[PDB]
Amino acid sequence: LVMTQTPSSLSASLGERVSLTCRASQDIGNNLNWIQQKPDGTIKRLIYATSSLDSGVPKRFSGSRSGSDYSLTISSLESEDFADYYCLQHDTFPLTFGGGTKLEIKRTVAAPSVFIFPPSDEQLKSGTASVVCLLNNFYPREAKVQWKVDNALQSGNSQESVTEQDSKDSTYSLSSTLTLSKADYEKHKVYACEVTHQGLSSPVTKSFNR
Amino acid sequence: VQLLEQSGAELVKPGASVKLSCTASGFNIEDSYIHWVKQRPEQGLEWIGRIDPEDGETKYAPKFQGKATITADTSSNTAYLHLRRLTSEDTAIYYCGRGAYYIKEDFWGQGTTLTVSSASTKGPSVFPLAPSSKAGGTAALGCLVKDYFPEPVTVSWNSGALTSGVHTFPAVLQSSGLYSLSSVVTVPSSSLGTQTYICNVNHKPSNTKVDKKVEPA
Amino acid sequence: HGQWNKPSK
């Protein structure tokens, strides 16, 4: 028995209506639930027994069969709906989940707020220095953060991390951490972070001098 | 008042065995079917098996039947998932879901992250990310949670009182093969000199808890 | 009729 969930990925605007389908390979009847996994990992079943909504789950969530195709539908998409959805069949053993659907939210372009953090003294004494550059609340995901020590372009000495879409404003946040030895950090003076995003007319540069 | 609380995240050596737990609270565990679901990093959910604590009768998925052994203790009101001969393919988060009589009363547990490695646990070093920022009355601050292993780490602020604007980034893997992440948060600069901002890091695998105060200058 | 839930109890 193979539940074929489609689509794998889906990017939709707010207010829009989406439907996720799961093709039951051997007929499972009315035994098919729909669960939702929020970015933080938490799991909550939305639909049970094919169409019956669980307690508290909003009116915009519906379930319905149509042959060997079971589907979950959201009448109007909201920011808080950003999550991963899986269809579960509990008719025959082993119980099966669909491959899941990653639901992303189309949003309007938003420029990032940029912040720069110098290394803490508590870490300097440890022998290393981590300079952090924060790009808060922007959209779309793409961004080009560049590090410049004394106007010297950096490379191979920094790594980035990006959060998933925010449950409220559907934006992204990204940190670029430039790591150095207490040595190097003490040699130079000009520390600059240079952000380049779709939502900026000119690349922004936030900096601090040691 | 009724919920399923799972054991803490932990690291285990290969070839070994572990015994995950799931304690029911606010109801007798035998009044339901207890399922166990596995999820490998960046992967989909998988059903492992289910138990009827009433008599301990268990049903399993084919692939897990030679490794998993689910059990329960009516008195302790707990259901356990026991994995033998652990390997890298067993690193994943395990969830316990309730299968109550009144179908409307079903809910899941937070999950239990299990990392199977040859290495050892290492708590993190928490350095503060001082404010000193300017953006229209809004100032960013945070905590750099460096060099720890394995996953995961959980960062909260002011013991849970600060939530608005909190952005905890996903852990990045380093050259040392150790993880590192940072948690930030924006607050109005006007409240910098009066409110006390503390981040609370927690690394279950190594039983460490750190509370670092982030100060303005 | 399910398989996820407990029929008895």
Q: What is the CATH number of the domain that holds A122?
A: 2.60.40.10
The parent domain of residue A8 ranges over 1-107
Cβ distance of B167 and A95 shorter than 8 Å: no
Q: Which of A98, A117, A161 comes nearest B169 by C-beta? A: A161
Q: Are residues A29 and A115 in the same domain?
A: no
Alpha helices (runs of H) in chain B, residue ranges in sequence order: none
Q: Which of A85, A107, A129 is the last residue of a domain?
A: A107
Say which residues have a Cβ less than 8 Å from residue B75's Cβ, sequence separation at least 6.
none
Q: Are residues A113 and A204 in the same domain?
A: yes
- Residues of C with Cβ-Cβ distance to B31 under 8 angstroms: 6, 9
CATH superfamily of B119-216: Immunoglobulins (2.60.40.10)
Domains B1-118 and B119-216 share a fold: yes
- Residues of B with Cβ-Cβ distance to C1 under 8 angstroms: none
Determine if residue B177 is left, alpha or beta; phi over 0 gives left, psi from -120 to 50 gives alpha, anything else beta.
left
Q: Are residues A71 and A122 in the same domain?
A: no
Q: Is B52 on the interface with A (CB under 8 A)?
A: no
Q: One-letter amino acid identity for A135?
A: L
Cβ distance of B101 and C5 shorter than 8 Å: yes
Q: Are residues A102 and A134 in the same domain?
A: no
Residue A187, H or E segment: helix A182-187
* CA atoms of A53 and A83, how far apart (whole Å): 18
Residue A123, H or E segment: helix A121-124
B92 forms beta bridges with: B114
Q: Which of B70, B31, B32 has the alpha carbon at shortest distance from B48?
A: B70
CATH of domain B1-118: 2.60.40.10
Q: Are residues A112 and A48 in the same domain?
A: no
Sequence spans of domains, chain B: 1-118, 119-216
Q: In the Cβ-directed half-sphere of A23, how many Cα atoms lie within 13 Å?
A: 4
What dihedral do alpha carbons A39, A45, A50, A53 form, nearest 10°?
A: -110
- The CA distances from residue A126 to A86, A181, B62, B91, B146, in Å, are 46, 9, 51, 32, 12
Q: Is B129 on the interface with A (CB under 8 A)?
A: yes
Cβ distance of B184 and A173 shorter than 8 Å: yes
- Residues of B with Cβ-Cβ distance to A55 under 8 angstroms: 104
* CA atoms of B29 and B58, how far apart (whole Å): 15
Method: X-ray
Q: Which of A78, A107, A136 is the last residue of a domain?
A: A107
Residue A182 has φ and ψ, to the nearest 5°, of: -50, -30
Nearest Cα of chain B lies from the Cα of C7 at a distance, in angstroms, of: 7
Q: Are residues A120 and A203 in the same domain?
A: yes
Total domains in the fold of chain A: 2
Q: Which of B44, B140, B171 comes nearest A97 by C-beta? A: B44
Resolution limit, Å: 2.8
Q: Which of A57, A74, A107 is the last residue of a domain?
A: A107
Q: Is A1 on the interface with C (CB under 8 A)?
A: no
Please tell me what DSSP assigns to residue A94: S
Q: Is C6 on the interface with B (CB under 8 A)?
A: yes
